[PDB]
């Protein structure tokens, strides 16, 4: 019964317009203590890019040591939330969510490559959705912006491509077991991920 009701709510959210999604807006700020040495933060901690000069980070237990990732400041276990990320030179980069308990060290700390995270990703300019180290290739888009709809109350996440209107990239139904952080990956030179304020 819950699964049948969840499905009807999911269809409603898949059909929402951008103004309707923006009603769930949440302000995401990047967490300085999580950024890998190769990740530079700028514009009042709303932009992540690949560092071209030393960032002079101190080692921190919450800092990613293996891959070029960074988290948002806050995590969410209740409510329904929406944020957007503008991309430049998106040859190798990723946008997703993860449990706080995701490992921050070693190969398994990569977004979508473990059971604690979900993401969409550009990889040699080709798009895929990832969870639990299982890939789903997706059609290309000319959009330069991703919208993430995180629904903790009903249990799903949706990734939208945002241009003049919104288009589905991929979704996951999940009965989440703990709070979720926005999460980001920037790997190719010149790649930038900018959190939007519309």
Q: What are phi and psi of 21, to 5 degrees?
A: -65, -40
Backbone dihedral region for residue 172 (phi beyond 0: left; psi -120 to 50: alpha; all else: beta): beta
Nearest in space to 109 (alpha carbons), one of 185, 172, 175, 54: 185
Q: How was this structure determined?
A: X-ray
Q: What is the DSSP letter of 108?
A: G
Task: Quote the CA–CA distance of 70 and 182 in Å, as a whole number.
Answer: 9
What is the chain's Cα-based Rg?
A: 16
Q: Is 110 left (phi over 0), alpha (psi -120 to 50) or beta?
A: beta
Q: Dihedral (C-alpha) 108, 39, 49, 187: value to the nearest 10 degrees?
A: -40
Alpha-carbon distance of 175 to 135, in angstroms, equals 20
Of the candidates 166, 196, 192, the one whose C-alpha atom is nearest the C-alpha of residue 84 is 196
Task: Report strand pairing: 92-99 vs 117-123.
Answer: antiparallel
Burial 154-187 (b: 16+ CB within 10 A, else e): bbbbbbbbbeeebeebbbeeeebeeebbbbbbbb
Dist CA 64 CA 82 (whole Å):
25
- Residue 72 DSSP label: B
Q: What secondary structure letter does DSSP report for 24?
A: T
Looking only at the bridges linking them, the beta strands covering 92-99 and 69-71 are unpaired
Side-chain-side CA neighbours of 127 within 13 Å: the count stands at: 17
Instruction: State the architecture of 1-198 in CATH terms.
Output: Sandwich (2.60)
- The residues, ordered by sequence, that sit 6+ positions from 40 with a Cβ below 8 Å of its Cβ are 48, 49, 50, 51, 52, 53, 55
């Amino acid at each position: 019964g819950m699964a049948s009701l969840k499905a009807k709510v999911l269809e409603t959210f898949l059909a929402k317009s951008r103004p309707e999604l923006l009603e769930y807006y949440i302000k995401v700020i990047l967490d300085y203590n999580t950024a890998h040495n190769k990740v530079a933060l700028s514009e009042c901690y709303t932009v992540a890019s690949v560092a071209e000069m030393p960032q002079n980070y101190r080692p921190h237990p919450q800092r990613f040591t293996y891959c070029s990732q960074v988290l948002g400041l806050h995590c969410y276990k209740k409510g329904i939330h929406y944020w957007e990320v503008e991309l430049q030179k998106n040859n190798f980069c990723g946008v997703g969510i993860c449990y706080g308990s995701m490992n921050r060290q070693g190969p398994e700390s990569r977004l979508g490559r473990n059971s604690a995270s979900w993401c969409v990703e550009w990889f040699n300019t080709k798009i895929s959705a990832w969870h639990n180290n299982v890939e789903k290739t997706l059609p290309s888009t000319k959009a330069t912006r991703v919208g993430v709809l995180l629904n903790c109350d009903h249990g799903f996440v949706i990734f939208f491509a945002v241009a003049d209107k919104v288009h589905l990239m991929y979704k996951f139904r999940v009965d989440f077991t703990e709070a979720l952080y926005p999460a980001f990956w920037v790997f190719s030179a010149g790649a930038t991920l900018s959190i939007c304020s519309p």
